Design a protein around this ligand. Structure first.
Ligand code: BCL
Ligand code: BCL
Ligand code: BCL
Ligand SMILES: C/C=C1/c2cc3[nH]c4c(c3C)C(=O)[C@H](C(=O)OC)c4c3nc(cc4[nH]c(cc(n2)[C@@H]1C)c(C(C)=O)c4C)[C@@H](C)[C@@H]3CCC(=O)OC/C=C(\C)CCC[C@H](C)CCC[C@H](C)CCCC(C)C
Ligand SMILES: C/C=C1/c2cc3[nH]c4c(c3C)C(=O)[C@H](C(=O)OC)c4c3nc(cc4[nH]c(cc(n2)[C@@H]1C)c(C(C)=O)c4C)[C@@H](C)[C@@H]3CCC(=O)OC/C=C(\C)CCC[C@H](C)CCC[C@H](C)CCCC(C)C
Ligand SMILES: CC(C)=CCC/C(C)=C/CC/C(C)=C/CC/C(C)=C/CC/C(C)=C/CC/C(C)=C/CC/C(C)=C/CC/C(C)=C/COP(=O)(O)OP(=O)(O)O
Ligand SMILES: CC(C)=CCC/C(C)=C/CC/C(C)=C/CC/C(C)=C/CC/C(C)=C/CC/C(C)=C/CC/C(C)=C/CC1=C(C)C(=O)c2ccccc2C1=O
Ligand code: HEC
Ligand code: HEC
Ligand code: HEC
Ligand SMILES: CC(C)=CCC/C(C)=C/C=C\C(C)=C\C=C\C(C)=C\C=C/C=C(C)/C=C/C=C(\C)CC/C=C(\C)CCCC(C)C
Ligand SMILES: CCCCCCCC/C=C\CCCCCCCCOC(=O)[C@H](O)CO
Ligand SMILES: [Fe+2]
Lengths: 243, 323, 332, 273
């Protein structure tokens, strides 16, 4: 006699083997794959139940996003087959298309553990510092991709919750300026802030915001998106073949 | 290039965070210290840390076990301080070598091991409460507490459950650097090559996938770090351009994608399943399967190869051959 | 910390199994030049004459040889065992019939043992066979012996450190490790397995499912046995200077047929042979060796794998004197 | 065919080579030049596996195996049935992996993000080269490489590990394992944390980034941060094959004994011995 032996040539561990596959595929297909389709769906041109998040300081938001009004494309198709690429009809940086695109999410400045504005300047930020040893961008020149001075540092904007700088903001030469640059787009030297995402003439369009002391989320996305649009559109030299 | 994904070029300092928990706000201990070199690749502030009854019970039980182990290690080299520091990796505390069944083994042969095992269990159970209670003390889900349970459960399997199921303390895992490593092979040998245990393949498939997933996800979030992707809580309840491109990179690559939320369910599950699959493997092992290779052969799953060197007959079965 | 390339690799299993040897040329080269000191067989001699059972007074093993053939053996033995002190190591200067010193009586036993090996254990030594040198290598005390406990160094021609000495108990773990290829396996495979025929090397089941009556509680062998088996294997591997795949397809260590190499079967006959040698020839010698030869439990030096192999798959790389000295076996 | 927020992004450009010619989509899949080359290598490779599986007493997946040549063929060409099939499939596999990588570069390019993912993907491709090309080249023959079969290639790893007595003592392996473990741990923690904040129970308030750091300040006395866990994560996951490659290439070319003995450098030091 043997432990685990059953009818026929069957045994216990053999049965569990099937149960293991059944559970795994059940979880993957009938849960995880459906949890994956909470946004982006339904498709255009199988879904799960709703869910309602109760947000930290008032109000709720629930999967899908049923939105304000929808933006109007500034792009033309390149050919008529389903999978053909599109093409900017204007300046792709100004109509926010392709890698210059942003998300349509509430124009609310979203906040801190305790209500205050989370992304704020140091002239606001009270008690925040630049850590001794790291260089102070205060008053440094911002050198664009063409090598021309696009302007100079004004202030640096901190996350009050994570203690982490996320935007430089600065003056342009010659337009009575000022506007945002995500520091993912900056190379902080000892005497200059190097930016290769856009040319100096193109800082002129960096999305301004209704506020000088605020910054909301659509803003945060509107600002970041345009520099990222420069990686492909700054010159005719970036929509290229690299080779 | 994103120089922020490599290190934080400009670092920020400010007044200490402190979010109140439902209890134990006062049992936080430590004046928070700032390290510049730490803050190049993480947040510079170290401490404070929460004590609380469960936490201190953990260190009490835990230290007790370690003391037992280190003391038994020290005796293996006559308490010679030189040799101990030398032979440390080869030193260990071993489960009973003779077969006492489930009977509590003599102190010199398994006794101290079982006791160190016991205090270690109390130590893990104490820390679990800490992981659980702190979650709902801060009004957070217990997702971490339940993942940590699966790991705790598995350790119990190789530690005492599977021993109890087969009925021998000799099958326990020893304490030590090399000695607990030695167990791995003794256990695999005994049960017919663990490469042929399906739950072993499953557990491996999930562990590797833990590598793949957070290599991909880790790199994904770094790639969209210019769009504030690392801010994920406020990318779940509210979709911005970060996980717009993240969802699309994968949709254009492999034909399907997740959400910024759901990808965390994928990684939590995979990690969980490393432990879930493993535990099931150990339980089945000894209990209902005695040789995983032969088990596979029985079900016709094992591969077979042509002879290179000639076939070798078992000499013990030869006529006239010694015992 | 590392051994420079290239490396010598052999194939012992089907392609793509990663089965085979891994050898470092410099090590291998050094071992040959060591094993090449095997003295050449002595030139042949007069086939005719009275058998020494007529001629000599106290000859009981080699009594059918002629006087010229018999002395030849004595010269060879002298070469192989005690070349430096010569005959007088084992003979009273002017009474060659006298057994008045201890190496004489042992040497008789040793003659029979050698013949025993070449005759009864051809499942192992085949036609390669052994002589006195295969273990002695030119000295009365064989370099690689084992007592009833771990000793260090493995080669007794080497000076032991203080921590290596058996009396220093702080260094017991290392003595155990170095006999098992530096593993932390807490077991001595010599006394457990090779000193006698008491215990079973095999510990892996030959059924898929657990067999009732031997799979629960005190019906079971402790897991410790599989450790010790691992320890024997580590020891044997280092003794022959190879790895597992020289014998096993590690897909299933417990299986023979195509899952094992012809060497594993030969190896099986070696364990059987080594037990024989220890139990019936070497261990009973503690009654004839001086106290200074004996171990701490009154044991005489006994043999393992390494005693003959000394780090090689074949002792002296296959070198033989078998047909050069037929009196050493096999015996009609 | 498209996500609700997708057509916003499907612009031309970001190609490395090909320009507009291959710059298009097939369903949800981007093509590009490296989409075309990938399919080529994948078709060829799978075909070879198929034709090779034609030939053995094959067909059930678990028993199907395509093996390298004998050691005796060295690094030379082998008879297609006696290892040549493996040689070709090997090549196809490398073509597929590298193509897939550069395709990802093209997709990153069009989306205006960092190239971190296809750069991460170079690590497993790299390890595959260590196993199938590098270590063979040092050892002198292709026969040292692992076979393409669901169960058969396990037995390759199994025997290889034992060729060095106890592969566990391989210091390169100890590092590799250490990373695999802690990476699985960190993935469980991190995913678990993010869910805990967004999914905290009942009729809840979704918590904040301050609650995140909070939680790990209390339990272990430190929180690495939101962004830093993702660079830490790529770091641990990558070092599995980054550190492990050392222990693999060291086995054979630079060490022929058992790995437990390798620690003789520490154990055998004259003043401890
Ligand atoms: C040195 C270390 C060893 C190694 C040691 C092990 C061990 C040990 C185990 C595996 C296991 C697996 N290995 Mg392996 N493996 C190595 C290299 C490889 C390579 C390769 C390109 O080099 C491949 C394709 C695989 C593939 C696989 C899968 C069959 C399986 C699950 C892995 C997993 O979930 O990963 C994470 C990935 C995911 C979760 C995503 C899904 C991936 C699926 C599973 C891939 C299937 C590919 C399949 C072979 C078909 C190939 C292509 C055909 C042309 C259609 N291994 C090397 C040679 N691997 C386990 C198993 O069950 O084996 C039977 C197992 O026990
Ligand atoms: C010859 C040796 C055997 C072998 C022997 C075994 C055995 C035996 C087992 C495994 C198991 C596993 N093996 Mg295997 N393994 C081999 C080959 C492989 C290969 C390979 C490519 O060759 C791979 C990838 C793996 C990988 C894996 C894992 C996926 C799996 C789960 C264990 C784990 O992750 O533990 C890491 C995680 C933990 C240990 C969890 C720890 C959680 C706790 C809470 C941590 C406590 C810390 C605390 C501070 C401690 C304080 C102590 C004080 C004293 C108080 N093995 C070969 C075949 N392996 C297991 C399995 O799945 O079996 C079916 C198992 O039991
Ligand atoms: C007796 C056997 C030995 C053993 C022998 C070995 C050997 C030999 C090796 C390892 C190696 C590894 N071992 Mg092991 N190992 C053992 C015990 C363990 C234990 C344990 C619990 O004891 C653990 C945790 C591990 C774990 C590990 C891994 C961390 C490590 C690297 C795996 C690897 O190379 O994957 C390789 C995986 C890949 C290359 C994947 C590549 C994927 C490519 C890029 C894409 C594939 C696409 C696919 C085909 C597409 C299909 C399409 C589908 C639609 C999806 N081992 C035992 C003791 N182990 C290696 C190492 O680093 O050692 C230092 C190594 O060389
Ligand atoms: C697949 C999923 C996995 C996974 C998952 C998770 N893992 C978690 C959690 C989750 C989800 C937690 O939430 C929890 C935690 O906090 O996260 C921050 C935790 C933890 N995972 C630890 C270790 C670990 N996980 C391993 C494995 C995996 N984990 C696998 C991979 C391994 C391996 C591989 O060996 C190790 C070593 C500890 C750090 C911690 C428990 C501490 C404990 O229970 O301490 C109790 C013990 C003590 C308090 C002793 C204190 C001793 C001091 C020095 C006293 C002084 C002594 C004096 C000198 C004596 C003389
Ligand atoms: C250390 C870092 C690691 C890591 C990381 C990342 N991993 C990535 C990425 C990153 C970052 C991606 O971005 C990319 C991707 O998009 O993900 C969704 C990818 C992917 N990781 C896959 C598998 C995978 N990763 C493993 C290992 C790690 N990943 C480790 C952990 C393992 C293990 C452990 O076995 C597996 C099985 C695929 C799913 C996918 C590539 C598809 C491909 O390249 O398609 C192109 C190729 C094909 C579709 C098929 C080609 C078939 C050949 C020609 C014919 C067969 C030959 C083959 C050799 C036969 C083998 C037989 C077998 C039994 C031996
Ligand atoms: C809609 C859509 C696009 C969905 C896509 C979803 C998708 C692709 C998800 C992928 C993620 C998934 C599913 C991961 C799961 C795979 C994982 C984690 C592990 C698989 C690992 C694996 C193959 C393990 C096998 C275990 C082993 C080694 C078994 C060998 C022994 C064996 C098979 C014995 C025979 C078994 C028996 C009893 C009978 C057979 O006859
Ligand atoms: C028809 C045809 C030939 C067309 C030609 C065009 C062309 C190139 C087609 C490609 C054809 C091929 C080869 C398709 C195969 C694609 C492959 C390899 C599919 C395998 C899928 C597997 C098994 C992936 C393993 C990893 C895994 C479990 C993923 C599940 C969870 C997911 C989707 C993670 C990806 C993911 C991550 C990691 C995020 O971080 C993230 C962050 C924010 C939003 C979304 C995401 C997201 O989706
Ligand atoms: C290591 C052991 C050893 C060495 C070396 C050795 N002897 Fe022998 N000798 C013996 C033994 C034992 C016998 C008896 C063997 C027997 O009974 O078959 C013996 C027998 C003899 C006899 C027979 C005398 C008699 O009447 O029994 C003579 C003569 C002899 N040896 C001479 C020599 C010579 C000559 C040499 C070297 C040139 C030599 N011995 C070296 C051990 C040795
Ligand atoms: C030169 C010979 C040789 C070498 C080298 C060798 N083996 Fe062994 N192995 C054997 C023989 C012979 C047996 C069976 C002994 C018996 O039947 O009494 C065996 C038994 C075993 C067993 C147990 C089989 C069972 O039925 O329980 C395992 C496991 C094993 N070997 C693994 C190993 C390991 C591990 C190594 C090296 C680290 C190794 N082999 C190297 C010859 C060898
Ligand atoms: C007293 C002598 C002696 C001892 C002890 C000894 N060997 Fe042998 N062994 C030999 C000789 C002589 C050969 C040569 C056989 C041949 O040339 O085919 C040999 C051959 C072998 C071979 C065949 C190698 C090959 O390449 O064909 C293996 C394997 C082996 N021995 C393993 C062992 C094992 C296992 C043990 C003990 C457990 C052992 N040896 C101890 C004398 C010994
Ligand atoms: C100084 C600092 C910072 C840290 C110190 C750490 C240190 C140096 C420790 C000393 C030596 C070391 C490294 C030890 C490591 C040991 C290792 C790797 C152990 C690994 C695994 C051990 C395991 C899984 C043991 C499991 C055993 C159990 C779970 C036993 C369960 C027992 C029971 C349930 C008791 C119930 C039965 C009752 C009737 C008595
Ligand atoms: C998952 C393991 C993470 C380990 C990180 C531990 C870092 C050590 C931190 C200690 C904090 C103790 C408070 C510091 C002030 C001392 C009073
Ligand atoms: Fe994340």
């Amino acid at each position: 006699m043997y432990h685990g032996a059953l009818a026929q040539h069957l045994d216990i561990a053999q049965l569990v083997w099937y149960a293991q596959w059944l559970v795994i595929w059940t979880v993957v297909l009938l849960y995880l794959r459906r949890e994956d389709r909470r946004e982006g769906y339904p498709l255009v041109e199988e879904l799960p139940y709703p869910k309602t998040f109760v947000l930290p300081h008032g109000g709720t938001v629930t999967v899908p996003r049923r939105r304000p009004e929808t933006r109007e494309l500034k792009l033309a198709q390149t050919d008529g087959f389903e999978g053909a690429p599109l093409q900017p009809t204007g300046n792709p940086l100004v109509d926010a298309v392709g890698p210059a695109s942003y998300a349509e999410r509430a124009e609310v400045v979203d906040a801190t553990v305790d209500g205050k504005a989370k992304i704020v300047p140091l002239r606001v930020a009270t008690d925040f510092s630049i850590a001794e040893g790291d260089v102070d961008p205060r008053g440094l020149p911002v050198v664009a991709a063409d090598g021309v001075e696009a302007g100079t540092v004004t202030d640096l904007w901190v996350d009050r919750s994570e203690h982490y700088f996320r935007y430089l903001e600065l003056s342009v030469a010659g337009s009575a300026r000022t506007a945002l640059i995500p520091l993912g787009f900056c190379d902080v030297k000892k005497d200059k802030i190097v930016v290769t995402s856009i040319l100096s003439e193109q800082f002129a369009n960096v999305p301004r915001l209704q506020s000088r002391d605020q910054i909301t989320l659509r803003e945060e996305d509107k600002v970041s998106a345009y520099y990222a649009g420069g990686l492909l559109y700054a010159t005719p030299e970036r929509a290229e073949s690299l080779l | 290039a994103d120089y922020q994904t490599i290190y934080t070029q400009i670092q920020a300092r400010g007044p200490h965070i402190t979010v109140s928990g439902e209890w134990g706000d006062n049992d936080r201990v430590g004046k928070p210290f700032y390290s510049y070199w730490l803050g190049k690749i993480g947040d510079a502030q170290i401490g404070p840390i929460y004590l609380g009854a469960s936490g201190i019970a953990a260190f009490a039980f835990g230290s007790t076990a370690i003391l037992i182990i280190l003391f038994n290690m020290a005796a293996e080299v006559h308490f010679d301080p030189l040799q101990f520091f030398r032979q440390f990796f080869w030193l260990g505390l071993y489960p009973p070598k003779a077969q006492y069944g489930m009977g509590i083994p003599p102190l010199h042969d398994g006794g101290w091991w079982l006791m160190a095992g016991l205090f270690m269990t109390l130590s893990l159970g104490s820390w679990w409460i800490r992981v659980y209670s702190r979650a709902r003390a801060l009004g957070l889900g217990t997702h971490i507490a339940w993942n940590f349970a699966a790991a705790i459960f598995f350790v119990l399997c190789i530690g005492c459950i599977h021993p109890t199921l087969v009925g021998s303390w000799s099958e326990g895992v020893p304490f030590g650097i090399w000695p607990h490593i030695d167990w791995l092979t003794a256990f695999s040998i005994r049960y017919g090559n663990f490469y042929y245990c399906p739950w072993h393949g499953f557990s491996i498939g999930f562990a590797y996938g833990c590598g793949l997933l957070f290599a991909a996800h880790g790199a994904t979030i770094l790639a969209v770090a210019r769009f504030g992707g690392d801010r994920e809580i406020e990318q779940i309840t509210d979709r911005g351009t970060a996980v717009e491109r993240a969802a699309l990179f994968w949709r254009w690559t492999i034909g399907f994608n997740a959400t910024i939320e759901s990808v965390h369910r994928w990684g939590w599950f995979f990690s969980l399943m490393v432990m879930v699959s493993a535990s099931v493997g150990i339980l089945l092992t000894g209990t209902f399967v005695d040789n995983w290779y032969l088990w596979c052969v029985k079900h016709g799953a094992a591969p077979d190869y042509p002879a290179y060197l000639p076939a070798t007959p078992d000499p013990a079965s030869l006529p006239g051959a010694p015992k | 910390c590392f051994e420079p390339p290239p490396a010598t690799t052999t194939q012992t299993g089907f392609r793509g199994l990663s089965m085979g040897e891994v050898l470092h040329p410099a090590t291998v080269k050094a071992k040959k030049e060591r094993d090449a000191q095997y003295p050449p067989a002595l030139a042949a001699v007069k086939a005719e004459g009275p058998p020494v059972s007529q001629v000599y007074k106290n000859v009981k093993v080699l009594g059918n040889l002629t006087e010229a053939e018999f002395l030849r053996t004595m010269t060879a033995i002298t070469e192989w065992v005690s070349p430096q002190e010569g005959c007088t190591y084992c003979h009273d200067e002017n009474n060659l019939a006298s057994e008045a010193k201890y190496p004489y009586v042992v040497a008789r036993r040793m003659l029979e043992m050698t013949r025993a090996i070449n005759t009864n254990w051809t499942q192992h030594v085949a036609q390669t066979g052994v002589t006195c040198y295969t273990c002695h290598r030119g000295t009365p005390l064989p370099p690689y012996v084992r007592y009833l406990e771990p000793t260090l160094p493995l080669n007794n021609r080497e000076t032991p450190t203080h921590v290596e000495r058996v009396e220093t108990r702080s260094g017991y773990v290392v003595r155990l490790a170095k006999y098992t290829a530096y593993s932390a396996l807490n077991y001595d495979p010599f006394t457990m397995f090779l000193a006698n025929d008491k215990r079973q090397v095999r510990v892996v089941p030959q059924t898929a499912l657990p067999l009732v009556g031997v799979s629960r509680g005190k019906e079971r062998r402790p897991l410790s046995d599989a450790y010790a088996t691992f320890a024997l294997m580590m020891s044997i591997s280092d003794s022959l200077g190879t790895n597992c795949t020289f014998c096993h397809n590690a897909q299933t260590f417990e299986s023979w047929g195509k899952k094992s190499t012809p060497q594993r079967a030969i190896a099986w006959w070696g364990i059987r042979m080594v037990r024989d040698l220890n139990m019936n020839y070497l261990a009973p010698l503690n009654a004839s060796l001086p106290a200074s030869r004996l171990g701490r439990q009154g044991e005489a030096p006994q043999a393992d794998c390494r005693t003959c192999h000394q780090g090689v798959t074949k002792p002296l790389f296959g070198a033989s004197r078998l047909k050069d000295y037929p009196e050493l076996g096999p015996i009609k | 065919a498209l996500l609700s927020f997708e057509r916003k992004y499907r612009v031309r450009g970001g190609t490395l080579i090909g320009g507009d010619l291959f710059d298009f989509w097939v369903g949800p899949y981007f093509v590009g030049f490296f989409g075309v080359s990938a399919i080529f290598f994948i078709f060829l490779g799978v075909s070879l596996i198929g034709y090779a599986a034609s030939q053995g007493p094959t067909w059930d997946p678990f028993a199907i195996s395509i093996n390298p040549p004998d050691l005796k063929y060295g690094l030379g060409a082998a008879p297609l049935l006696e290892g040549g099939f493996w040689q070709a499939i090997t090549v196809c596999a490398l073509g597929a992996f590298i193509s897939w990588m550069l395709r990802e570069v093209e997709i990153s390019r069009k989306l205006g993000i960092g190239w971190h993912v296809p750069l991460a993907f170079c690590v497993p491709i790299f390890m595959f080269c260590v196993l199938q090309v590098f270590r063979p080249l040092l050892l002198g023959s292709w026969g040292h490489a692992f076979p393409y079969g669901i169960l058969s290639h396990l037995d390759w790893v199994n025997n290889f590990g034992y060729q060095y007595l106890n592969w566990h003592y391989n210091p390169g392996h100890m590092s590799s394992v250490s990373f695999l473990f802690v990476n699985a741990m960190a993935l469980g923690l991190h995913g678990g944390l993010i869910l805990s904040v967004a999914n905290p129970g009942d009729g809840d308030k979704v918590k904040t980034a301050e609650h995140e750091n909070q939680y790990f300040r209390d339990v272990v006395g430190y929180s690495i941060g939101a962004l830093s866990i993702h660079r830490l994560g790529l770091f641990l996951a990558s070092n599995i094959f980054l550190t492990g490659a050392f222990g693999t290439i060291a086995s054979g070319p630079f060490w022929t004994r058992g790995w437990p003995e390798w620690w003789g450098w520490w154990l055998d030091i004259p003043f401890w011995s």
